[PDB]
């Protein structure tokens, strides 16, 4: 509260992790349907269906221009990505299942970064 602080992170490097994290997304094999956004013209559903898109390159764009206010922000853009992709896919799918690969990956990741 007022005056009673608690000692909390070194944020320093955050927006560097965050950066890099989200290039080995970037990188990682089963990243192609998520690296850019869905065609909402293309693809029927989507935008009656998911009322927040989210994609790895919108996720890079809001993070080199500074509107993400802290990681759980971040974190949750990440985390929507893979949420929108169980919703419209199911898991028994190529899409499916490189959401639940994908998701698994920045978890650790997120974990064996941040998380002591
Ligand atoms: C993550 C996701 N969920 C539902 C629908 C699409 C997508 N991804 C788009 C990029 C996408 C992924 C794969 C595609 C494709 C578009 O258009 C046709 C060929 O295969």
């Known amino acids: 509260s007022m005056s009673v602080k608690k000692p909390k992170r070194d944020d320093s490097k955050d927006l560097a992790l965050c950066s890099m994290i989200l290039t080995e997304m970037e990188t990682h094999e089963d990243a192609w349907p998520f690296l850019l956004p869905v065609n909402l013209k293309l693809v029927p559903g989507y935008k009656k269906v998911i009322k927040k898109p989210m994609d790895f390159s919108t996720i890079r764009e809001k993070l080199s221009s500074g509107q993400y ?38 978890e650790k990741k997120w974990t064996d970064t941040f998380k002591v």
């Open 69 to 106: 206010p802290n990681l759980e922000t971040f974190a949750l853009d990440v985390r929507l990505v893979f949420d929108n992709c169980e919703t419209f896919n199911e898991d028994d799918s190529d899409i499916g299942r490189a959401g639940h690969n994908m998701r698994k990956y920045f």
